[PDB]
Scaffold this active site. Structure first.
Site, PDB file in Angstrom:
ATOM      1  N   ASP A 161       0.816  -1.194   0.000  1.00 22.59           N
ATOM      2  CA  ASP A 161       0.000   0.000   0.000  1.00 22.59           C
ATOM      3  C   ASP A 161       0.857   1.254   0.000  1.00 22.59           C
ATOM      4  OD1 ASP A 161      -2.019   1.911   0.412  1.00 22.59           O
ATOM      5  OD2 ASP A 161      -3.153   0.475   1.623  1.00 22.59           O
ATOM      6  N   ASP A 165      -4.247   7.090  -3.297  1.00 22.71           N
ATOM      7  CA  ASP A 165      -4.125   6.016  -2.321  1.00 22.71           C
ATOM      8  C   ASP A 165      -4.627   4.768  -3.038  1.00 22.71           C
ATOM      9  OD1 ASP A 165      -5.621   5.341   0.955  1.00 22.71           O
ATOM     10  OD2 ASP A 165      -3.935   4.440  -0.143  1.00 22.71           O
ATOM     11  N   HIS A 174     -12.020   5.845   2.861  1.00 21.10           N
ATOM     12  CA  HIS A 174     -12.050   7.215   3.349  1.00 21.10           C
ATOM     13  C   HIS A 174     -12.028   8.290   2.263  1.00 21.10           C
ATOM     14  CE1 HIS A 174      -7.698   7.373   2.495  1.00 21.10           C
ATOM     15  NE2 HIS A 174      -7.738   6.105   2.857  1.00 21.10           N
ATOM     16  N   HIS A 184      -6.918  11.685   5.089  1.00 19.02           N
ATOM     17  CA  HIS A 184      -8.252  11.393   5.596  1.00 19.02           C
ATOM     18  C   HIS A 184      -9.023  12.697   5.782  1.00 19.02           C
ATOM     19  CE1 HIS A 184     -10.886   9.013   8.698  1.00 19.02           C
ATOM     20  NE2 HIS A 184     -11.602   9.796   7.910  1.00 19.02           N
ATOM     21  N   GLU A 218     -11.384   1.027  -0.292  1.00 19.53           N
ATOM     22  CA  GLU A 218     -10.549  -0.115   0.047  1.00 19.53           C
ATOM     23  C   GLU A 218     -11.270  -1.051   0.999  1.00 19.53           C
ATOM     24  OE1 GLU A 218      -8.414   2.726   2.886  1.00 19.53           O
ATOM     25  OE2 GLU A 218      -6.951   1.110   2.771  1.00 19.53           O
ATOM     26  N   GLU A 278      -7.294  -1.534  -2.957  1.00 25.93           N
ATOM     27  CA  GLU A 278      -7.688  -0.134  -2.862  1.00 25.93           C
ATOM     28  C   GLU A 278      -7.550   0.629  -4.165  1.00 25.93           C
ATOM     29  OE1 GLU A 278      -7.021   3.382   0.422  1.00 25.93           O
ATOM     30  OE2 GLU A 278      -5.298   2.100  -0.109  1.00 25.93           O
TER      31      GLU A 278
HETATM   32  O1  LIG Z   1      -4.553   3.850   5.166  1.00 26.03           O
HETATM   33  C1  LIG Z   1      -4.832   5.020   5.087  1.00 26.03           C
HETATM   34  O2  LIG Z   1      -5.433   5.535   4.003  1.00 26.03           O
HETATM   35  C2  LIG Z   1      -4.523   6.012   6.272  1.00 26.03           C
HETATM   36  C3  LIG Z   1      -5.608   6.603   6.966  1.00 26.03           C
HETATM   37  N1  LIG Z   1      -7.010   6.328   6.617  1.00 26.03           N
HETATM   38  S1  LIG Z   1      -8.111   5.399   7.399  1.00 26.03           S
HETATM   39  O3  LIG Z   1      -8.142   5.834   8.785  1.00 26.03           O
HETATM   40  O4  LIG Z   1      -9.337   5.473   6.632  1.00 26.03           O
HETATM   41  C4  LIG Z   1      -7.499   3.726   7.327  1.00 26.03           C
HETATM   42  C5  LIG Z   1      -7.864   2.878   6.199  1.00 26.03           C
HETATM   43  C6  LIG Z   1      -7.372   1.515   6.134  1.00 26.03           C
HETATM   44  C7  LIG Z   1      -6.517   0.994   7.192  1.00 26.03           C
HETATM   45  C8  LIG Z   1      -6.154   1.840   8.319  1.00 26.03           C
HETATM   46  C9  LIG Z   1      -6.642   3.208   8.389  1.00 26.03           C
HETATM   47  C10 LIG Z   1      -5.375   7.488   8.031  1.00 26.03           C
HETATM   48  C11 LIG Z   1      -4.056   7.795   8.418  1.00 26.03           C
HETATM   49  C12 LIG Z   1      -2.942   7.226   7.747  1.00 26.03           C
HETATM   50  C13 LIG Z   1      -3.171   6.308   6.642  1.00 26.03           C
HETATM   51  C14 LIG Z   1      -1.994   5.666   5.885  1.00 26.03           C
HETATM   52  C15 LIG Z   1      -0.599   6.222   6.250  1.00 26.03           C
HETATM   53  C16 LIG Z   1      -0.453   6.602   7.734  1.00 26.03           C
HETATM   54  C17 LIG Z   1      -1.531   7.593   8.206  1.00 26.03           C
HETATM   55 MN   LIG Z   2      -3.780   2.818   1.307  1.00 21.34          MN
HETATM   56 MN   LIG Z   3      -6.573   4.192   2.387  1.00 23.08          MN
END
Ligand SMILES: O=C(O)c1c(NS(=O)(=O)c2ccccc2)ccc2c1CCCC2
Ligand SMILES: [Mn+2]
Ligand SMILES: [Mn+2]
Length: 369
Positions: free
Chosen positions: A142, A153, A222, A230, A255, A350
Protein backbone atom coordinates in the site's frame (compact mmCIF):
# COMPACT_ATOMS: atom_id res chain seq x y z
CA UNK A 1 9.10 10.11 -24.79
CA UNK A 2 9.34 6.40 -23.93
CA UNK A 3 9.72 4.69 -20.56
CA UNK A 4 12.86 2.65 -19.94
CA UNK A 5 12.59 -1.01 -18.88
CA UNK A 6 13.53 -0.30 -15.30
CA UNK A 7 11.33 2.84 -14.97
CA UNK A 8 13.34 6.07 -14.72
CA UNK A 9 11.60 8.78 -16.75
CA UNK A 10 9.27 11.08 -14.80
CA UNK A 11 5.64 10.73 -15.85
CA UNK A 12 5.89 14.46 -16.63
CA UNK A 13 8.61 13.87 -19.25
CA UNK A 14 6.53 11.15 -20.95
CA UNK A 15 3.62 13.45 -21.79
CA UNK A 16 4.99 16.71 -23.32
CA UNK A 17 1.44 17.95 -23.84
CA UNK A 18 1.00 18.29 -20.09
CA UNK A 19 -2.30 16.37 -20.15
CA UNK A 20 -2.43 13.00 -18.42
CA UNK A 21 -4.56 9.91 -19.18
CA UNK A 22 -7.92 9.59 -17.44
CA UNK A 23 -8.80 6.55 -15.39
CA UNK A 24 -11.73 4.22 -15.87
CA UNK A 25 -14.78 6.45 -16.38
CA UNK A 26 -18.05 4.92 -15.17
CA UNK A 27 -21.58 6.32 -15.15
CA UNK A 28 -22.95 7.04 -11.68
CA UNK A 29 -25.21 4.14 -10.60
CA UNK A 30 -28.98 4.89 -10.47
CA UNK A 31 -31.24 4.71 -7.39
CA UNK A 32 -34.71 3.47 -6.39
CA UNK A 33 -36.44 5.28 -9.28
CA UNK A 34 -33.77 3.86 -11.60
CA UNK A 35 -32.63 7.51 -11.57
CA UNK A 36 -29.97 7.22 -14.32
CA UNK A 37 -27.17 9.75 -14.66
CA UNK A 38 -27.03 9.62 -18.45
CA UNK A 39 -27.76 13.33 -18.05
CA UNK A 40 -24.66 14.26 -16.05
CA UNK A 41 -22.67 12.65 -18.85
CA UNK A 42 -23.21 15.72 -21.04
CA UNK A 43 -25.42 18.13 -19.09
CA UNK A 44 -24.36 21.67 -19.93
CA UNK A 45 -23.70 22.76 -16.34
CA UNK A 46 -22.09 19.53 -15.05
CA UNK A 47 -19.67 19.66 -17.98
CA UNK A 48 -18.55 23.20 -17.18
CA UNK A 49 -18.04 22.29 -13.52
CA UNK A 50 -15.81 19.36 -14.41
CA UNK A 51 -13.87 21.54 -16.84
CA UNK A 52 -13.47 24.06 -14.02
CA UNK A 53 -11.64 21.58 -11.78
CA UNK A 54 -9.76 20.13 -14.78
CA UNK A 55 -6.29 20.93 -13.49
CA UNK A 56 -7.03 19.12 -10.23
CA UNK A 57 -8.15 15.94 -11.96
CA UNK A 58 -5.10 16.19 -14.19
CA UNK A 59 -2.88 16.26 -11.11
CA UNK A 60 -4.58 13.18 -9.69
CA UNK A 61 -3.97 11.58 -13.08
CA UNK A 62 -0.28 12.38 -13.20
CA UNK A 63 -0.05 10.77 -9.79
CA UNK A 64 -2.06 7.71 -10.83
CA UNK A 65 0.13 7.01 -13.82
CA UNK A 66 3.13 7.10 -11.51
CA UNK A 67 1.39 4.58 -9.27
CA UNK A 68 0.43 2.34 -12.24
CA UNK A 69 3.97 2.23 -13.65
CA UNK A 70 5.56 1.68 -10.26
CA UNK A 71 3.34 -1.17 -9.08
CA UNK A 72 3.79 -2.79 -12.49
CA UNK A 73 7.57 -2.76 -11.93
CA UNK A 74 7.23 -4.01 -8.35
CA UNK A 75 5.17 -7.00 -9.48
CA UNK A 76 8.02 -8.16 -11.70
CA UNK A 77 10.69 -8.42 -9.02
CA UNK A 78 9.07 -8.75 -5.57
CA UNK A 79 10.09 -12.25 -4.48
CA UNK A 80 10.38 -14.12 -1.17
CA UNK A 81 13.95 -13.89 0.05
CA UNK A 82 14.24 -10.11 -0.21
CA UNK A 83 14.07 -8.15 3.04
CA UNK A 84 11.09 -5.92 3.74
CA UNK A 85 13.54 -3.01 3.64
CA UNK A 86 15.18 -3.77 0.27
CA UNK A 87 11.69 -4.12 -1.16
CA UNK A 88 10.41 -0.79 0.15
CA UNK A 89 13.61 1.03 -0.85
CA UNK A 90 13.51 -0.34 -4.40
CA UNK A 91 9.82 0.61 -4.61
CA UNK A 92 10.31 4.15 -3.23
CA UNK A 93 13.44 4.89 -5.30
CA UNK A 94 11.43 4.22 -8.44
CA UNK A 95 8.37 6.06 -7.13
CA UNK A 96 10.43 9.15 -6.34
CA UNK A 97 11.61 9.29 -9.95
CA UNK A 98 8.42 8.72 -11.92
CA UNK A 99 6.52 11.24 -9.76
CA UNK A 100 9.50 13.57 -10.25
CA UNK A 101 9.75 14.30 -6.55
CA UNK A 102 9.93 17.99 -5.68
CA UNK A 103 9.41 18.99 -2.07
CA UNK A 104 5.73 19.41 -1.27
CA UNK A 105 4.81 19.97 -4.95
CA UNK A 106 5.26 16.28 -5.80
CA UNK A 107 6.42 13.24 -3.88
CA UNK A 108 5.45 10.15 -1.92
CA UNK A 109 2.06 10.63 -0.22
CA UNK A 110 2.70 8.11 2.57
CA UNK A 111 5.23 5.37 3.46
CA UNK A 112 5.26 2.03 1.63
CA UNK A 113 3.00 -0.33 3.52
CA UNK A 114 3.94 -3.99 3.26
CA UNK A 115 1.92 -5.38 6.13
CA UNK A 116 2.43 -9.14 6.39
CA UNK A 117 -0.09 -11.93 6.90
CA UNK A 118 -2.32 -11.14 9.89
CA UNK A 119 -1.26 -7.49 9.80
CA UNK A 120 -3.51 -5.71 7.30
CA UNK A 121 -2.33 -2.13 7.35
CA UNK A 122 0.32 0.42 8.31
CA UNK A 123 3.44 -1.69 8.63
CA UNK A 124 6.65 -0.57 7.01
CA UNK A 125 10.16 -1.61 8.11
CA UNK A 126 12.31 0.55 10.40
CA UNK A 127 16.10 0.63 10.25
CA UNK A 128 17.27 -2.70 11.64
CA UNK A 129 14.23 -4.80 10.68
CA UNK A 130 15.56 -8.12 9.40
CA UNK A 131 12.18 -9.43 8.32
CA UNK A 132 12.47 -11.38 5.08
CA UNK A 133 9.54 -11.97 2.71
CA UNK A 134 8.52 -15.62 2.79
CA UNK A 135 6.99 -17.91 0.17
CA UNK A 136 3.88 -18.27 2.35
CA UNK A 137 3.44 -14.63 3.33
CA UNK A 138 0.53 -12.55 2.04
CA UNK A 139 1.92 -9.03 1.68
CA UNK A 140 -0.23 -5.91 1.19
CA UNK A 141 1.63 -3.29 -0.85
CA UNK A 142 0.00 0.00 0.00
CA UNK A 143 1.80 3.11 -1.25
CA UNK A 144 0.71 6.56 -2.44
CA UNK A 145 1.83 9.32 -4.79
CA UNK A 146 0.87 12.95 -5.16
CA UNK A 147 1.19 16.05 -7.28
CA UNK A 148 0.42 19.34 -5.57
CA UNK A 149 -1.21 17.44 -2.73
CA UNK A 150 -3.62 15.48 -4.93
CA UNK A 151 -3.24 12.05 -3.34
CA UNK A 152 -3.45 8.64 -4.97
CA UNK A 153 -4.13 6.02 -2.32
CA UNK A 154 -4.02 2.66 -4.14
CA UNK A 155 -3.05 -0.86 -3.01
CA UNK A 156 -2.91 -4.57 -3.81
CA UNK A 157 -2.02 -7.89 -2.22
CA UNK A 158 0.99 -10.00 -3.17
CA UNK A 159 1.28 -13.76 -2.69
CA UNK A 160 3.34 -16.62 -4.12
CA UNK A 161 1.35 -19.60 -2.87
CA UNK A 162 -1.94 -20.09 -4.80
CA UNK A 163 -3.73 -21.28 -1.65
CA UNK A 164 -4.63 -17.59 -1.12
CA UNK A 165 -5.88 -17.04 -4.66
CA UNK A 166 -9.53 -17.37 -3.78
CA UNK A 167 -9.10 -15.09 -0.76
CA UNK A 168 -7.61 -12.28 -2.83
CA UNK A 169 -10.48 -12.76 -5.25
CA UNK A 170 -13.08 -12.40 -2.52
CA UNK A 171 -11.57 -9.07 -1.46
CA UNK A 172 -10.75 -7.76 -4.96
CA UNK A 173 -14.35 -8.44 -5.87
CA UNK A 174 -15.55 -6.75 -2.69
CA UNK A 175 -13.41 -3.73 -3.48
CA UNK A 176 -14.72 -3.44 -7.03
CA UNK A 177 -18.29 -3.84 -5.76
CA UNK A 178 -17.63 -0.88 -3.49
CA UNK A 179 -16.18 1.19 -6.32
CA UNK A 180 -19.10 0.28 -8.57
CA UNK A 181 -21.76 1.00 -5.92
CA UNK A 182 -20.22 4.37 -4.97
CA UNK A 183 -21.37 7.65 -6.47
CA UNK A 184 -22.88 11.07 -5.85
CA UNK A 185 -25.77 10.90 -3.35
CA UNK A 186 -24.96 7.32 -2.40
CA UNK A 187 -25.09 6.76 1.37
CA UNK A 188 -21.89 5.43 2.91
CA UNK A 189 -23.71 2.75 4.91
CA UNK A 190 -25.12 1.32 1.69
CA UNK A 191 -21.67 1.02 0.19
CA UNK A 192 -20.59 -0.82 3.32
CA UNK A 193 -23.62 -3.07 3.28
CA UNK A 194 -22.87 -4.22 -0.28
CA UNK A 195 -19.11 -4.62 0.15
CA UNK A 196 -20.03 -7.06 2.89
CA UNK A 197 -22.71 -8.99 0.99
CA UNK A 198 -20.18 -9.81 -1.71
CA UNK A 199 -17.25 -10.28 0.65
CA UNK A 200 -19.17 -12.80 2.75
CA UNK A 201 -20.53 -14.70 -0.27
CA UNK A 202 -17.06 -16.20 -0.64
CA UNK A 203 -15.62 -19.03 1.42
CA UNK A 204 -12.12 -20.37 1.05
CA UNK A 205 -9.94 -23.33 1.97
CA UNK A 206 -6.42 -22.78 3.31
CA UNK A 207 -4.14 -25.48 4.74
CA UNK A 208 -7.01 -27.91 5.28
CA UNK A 209 -9.14 -25.44 7.24
CA UNK A 210 -12.04 -23.49 5.72
CA UNK A 211 -13.22 -19.96 6.44
CA UNK A 212 -15.82 -17.46 5.35
CA UNK A 213 -14.06 -14.28 4.31
CA UNK A 214 -14.70 -11.51 6.84
CA UNK A 215 -14.44 -7.76 6.22
CA UNK A 216 -12.21 -6.18 8.84
CA UNK A 217 -15.07 -4.38 10.59
CA UNK A 218 -12.92 -1.66 12.19
CA UNK A 219 -11.00 -0.90 8.96
CA UNK A 220 -12.44 1.03 6.03
CA UNK A 221 -12.25 3.44 3.12
CA UNK A 222 -12.05 7.22 3.35
CA UNK A 223 -12.54 10.58 1.66
CA UNK A 224 -9.31 12.27 0.53
CA UNK A 225 -8.56 15.97 0.96
CA UNK A 226 -5.63 18.06 -0.25
CA UNK A 227 -2.52 16.94 1.64
CA UNK A 228 -4.96 15.17 3.94
CA UNK A 229 -5.00 11.38 3.61
CA UNK A 230 -8.25 11.39 5.60
CA UNK A 231 -10.54 14.30 4.74
CA UNK A 232 -13.39 13.44 7.09
CA UNK A 233 -15.93 10.90 5.82
CA UNK A 234 -15.48 7.14 6.01
CA UNK A 235 -16.56 4.16 3.89
CA UNK A 236 -17.94 1.37 6.21
CA UNK A 237 -16.98 -2.01 4.65
CA UNK A 238 -19.72 -3.69 6.74
CA UNK A 239 -23.29 -3.12 7.99
CA UNK A 240 -22.08 0.13 9.59
CA UNK A 241 -24.08 3.27 8.80
CA UNK A 242 -21.89 6.29 9.58
CA UNK A 243 -24.43 9.13 9.09
CA UNK A 244 -23.53 10.63 5.72
CA UNK A 245 -23.75 10.61 1.94
CA UNK A 246 -21.09 10.94 -0.77
CA UNK A 247 -21.05 14.34 -2.46
CA UNK A 248 -20.22 15.77 -5.85
CA UNK A 249 -16.57 16.67 -6.36
CA UNK A 250 -15.30 14.46 -3.55
CA UNK A 251 -12.34 12.11 -3.80
CA UNK A 252 -12.56 8.73 -2.13
CA UNK A 253 -10.20 5.94 -1.34
CA UNK A 254 -12.23 2.77 -1.75
CA UNK A 255 -10.55 -0.11 0.05
CA UNK A 256 -11.70 -3.34 1.66
CA UNK A 257 -9.86 -5.84 3.85
CA UNK A 258 -10.64 -9.53 4.16
CA UNK A 259 -9.53 -11.81 7.00
CA UNK A 260 -9.71 -15.36 8.36
CA UNK A 261 -9.24 -14.28 11.95
CA UNK A 262 -11.82 -12.31 13.93
CA UNK A 263 -12.17 -9.58 11.33
CA UNK A 264 -10.87 -7.01 13.79
CA UNK A 265 -7.46 -5.31 13.86
CA UNK A 266 -5.51 -3.90 16.80
CA UNK A 267 -2.37 -1.83 17.43
CA UNK A 268 0.53 -4.26 17.26
CA UNK A 269 4.30 -4.45 16.87
CA UNK A 270 6.60 -1.43 16.58
CA UNK A 271 5.37 1.94 15.27
CA UNK A 272 6.73 3.31 11.99
CA UNK A 273 4.05 5.59 10.56
CA UNK A 274 3.58 9.16 11.78
CA UNK A 275 1.66 12.20 10.61
CA UNK A 276 1.30 15.82 11.63
CA UNK A 277 -2.24 16.55 12.80
CA UNK A 278 -3.96 18.67 10.13
CA UNK A 279 -6.09 20.51 12.68
CA UNK A 280 -3.25 21.37 15.07
CA UNK A 281 -1.84 24.87 14.74
CA UNK A 282 1.59 26.50 15.15
CA UNK A 283 2.99 25.56 18.56
CA UNK A 284 6.09 27.37 19.88
CA UNK A 285 8.90 25.09 21.10
CA UNK A 286 12.21 25.88 22.82
CA UNK A 287 13.39 22.29 23.36
CA UNK A 288 16.20 22.03 20.72
CA UNK A 289 15.87 18.51 19.30
CA UNK A 290 12.07 18.64 19.35
CA UNK A 291 12.01 22.05 17.66
CA UNK A 292 14.43 20.94 14.95
CA UNK A 293 12.57 17.70 14.28
CA UNK A 294 9.28 19.54 13.96
CA UNK A 295 10.93 21.90 11.47
CA UNK A 296 12.10 18.92 9.43
CA UNK A 297 8.59 17.51 9.43
CA UNK A 298 7.05 20.81 8.35
CA UNK A 299 9.66 21.28 5.62
CA UNK A 300 9.69 17.76 4.22
CA UNK A 301 6.24 16.33 4.92
CA UNK A 302 3.73 19.03 5.80
CA UNK A 303 0.66 17.06 6.88
CA UNK A 304 1.62 14.06 4.74
CA UNK A 305 2.51 10.82 6.51
CA UNK A 306 6.09 9.65 6.92
CA UNK A 307 8.14 6.92 8.59
CA UNK A 308 11.34 6.57 10.62
CA UNK A 309 13.33 5.56 7.53
CA UNK A 310 12.34 8.81 5.86
CA UNK A 311 13.90 10.61 8.81
CA UNK A 312 16.99 8.45 8.61
CA UNK A 313 17.59 9.38 4.98
CA UNK A 314 17.29 13.08 5.77
CA UNK A 315 20.25 12.63 8.08
CA UNK A 316 18.18 12.79 11.26
CA UNK A 317 19.61 10.71 14.07
CA UNK A 318 18.59 9.73 17.62
CA UNK A 319 15.19 11.41 17.36
CA UNK A 320 12.75 8.98 18.95
CA UNK A 321 12.60 11.07 22.12
CA UNK A 322 11.82 14.24 20.18
CA UNK A 323 9.31 12.30 18.09
CA UNK A 324 7.55 11.02 21.22
CA UNK A 325 7.38 14.64 22.39
CA UNK A 326 5.64 15.87 19.27
CA UNK A 327 3.33 12.87 19.69
CA UNK A 328 2.62 13.63 23.35
CA UNK A 329 2.20 17.35 22.59
CA UNK A 330 -0.51 16.18 20.19
CA UNK A 331 1.24 17.79 17.22
CA UNK A 332 2.08 14.46 15.62
CA UNK A 333 0.00 11.30 15.64
CA UNK A 334 1.50 7.82 15.57
CA UNK A 335 -0.01 5.24 13.22
CA UNK A 336 0.91 1.73 14.44
CA UNK A 337 0.41 -1.47 12.46
CA UNK A 338 -3.15 -2.81 12.52
CA UNK A 339 -3.12 -6.59 12.85
CA UNK A 340 -5.84 -9.20 13.31
CA UNK A 341 -5.31 -12.24 15.58
CA UNK A 342 -2.12 -14.29 15.18
CA UNK A 343 -2.27 -17.12 12.68
CA UNK A 344 -4.96 -15.43 10.58
CA UNK A 345 -4.49 -14.14 7.04
CA UNK A 346 -5.65 -10.81 5.60
CA UNK A 347 -5.89 -9.21 2.13
CA UNK A 348 -6.59 -5.70 0.72
CA UNK A 349 -7.47 -3.89 -2.52
CA UNK A 350 -7.69 -0.13 -2.86
CA UNK A 351 -8.38 2.52 -5.47
CA UNK A 352 -8.80 6.26 -5.53
CA UNK A 353 -11.87 7.58 -7.27
CA UNK A 354 -12.96 11.02 -8.40
CA UNK A 355 -16.61 11.97 -8.09
CA UNK A 356 -16.61 14.45 -10.99
CA UNK A 357 -19.88 16.22 -12.02
CA UNK A 358 -20.22 14.28 -15.28
CA UNK A 359 -18.99 10.78 -14.40
CA UNK A 360 -17.30 8.64 -11.75
CA UNK A 361 -13.59 8.11 -12.41
CA UNK A 362 -11.49 5.24 -11.05
CA UNK A 363 -8.36 7.31 -11.66
CA UNK A 364 -5.99 4.65 -10.28
CA UNK A 365 -7.31 1.69 -12.31
CA UNK A 366 -4.88 -0.23 -14.50
CA UNK A 367 -4.14 -3.35 -16.52
CA UNK A 368 -3.54 -5.20 -13.26
CA UNK A 369 -6.48 -4.33 -11.01
O1 LIG B 1 -4.55 3.85 5.17
C1 LIG B 1 -4.83 5.02 5.09
O2 LIG B 1 -5.43 5.53 4.00
C2 LIG B 1 -4.52 6.01 6.27
C3 LIG B 1 -5.61 6.60 6.97
N1 LIG B 1 -7.01 6.33 6.62
S1 LIG B 1 -8.11 5.40 7.40
O3 LIG B 1 -8.14 5.83 8.78
O4 LIG B 1 -9.34 5.47 6.63
C4 LIG B 1 -7.50 3.73 7.33
C5 LIG B 1 -7.86 2.88 6.20
C6 LIG B 1 -7.37 1.52 6.13
C7 LIG B 1 -6.52 0.99 7.19
C8 LIG B 1 -6.15 1.84 8.32
C9 LIG B 1 -6.64 3.21 8.39
C10 LIG B 1 -5.37 7.49 8.03
C11 LIG B 1 -4.06 7.80 8.42
C12 LIG B 1 -2.94 7.23 7.75
C13 LIG B 1 -3.17 6.31 6.64
C14 LIG B 1 -1.99 5.67 5.89
C15 LIG B 1 -0.60 6.22 6.25
C16 LIG B 1 -0.45 6.60 7.73
C17 LIG B 1 -1.53 7.59 8.21
MN1 LIG C 1 -3.78 2.82 1.31
MN1 LIG D 1 -6.57 4.19 2.39
Amino acid sequence: KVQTDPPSVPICDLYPNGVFPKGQECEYPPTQDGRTAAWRTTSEEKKALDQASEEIWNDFREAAEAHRQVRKYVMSWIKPGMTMIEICEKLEDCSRKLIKENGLNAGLAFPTGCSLNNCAAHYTPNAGDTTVLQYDDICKIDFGTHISGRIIDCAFTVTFNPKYDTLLKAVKDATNTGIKCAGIDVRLCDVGEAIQEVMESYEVEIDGKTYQVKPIRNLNGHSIGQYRIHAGKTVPIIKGGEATRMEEGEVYAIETFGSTGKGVVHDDMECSHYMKNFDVGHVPIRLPRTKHLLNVINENFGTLAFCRRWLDRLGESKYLMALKNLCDLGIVDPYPPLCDIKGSYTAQFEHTILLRPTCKEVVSRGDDY
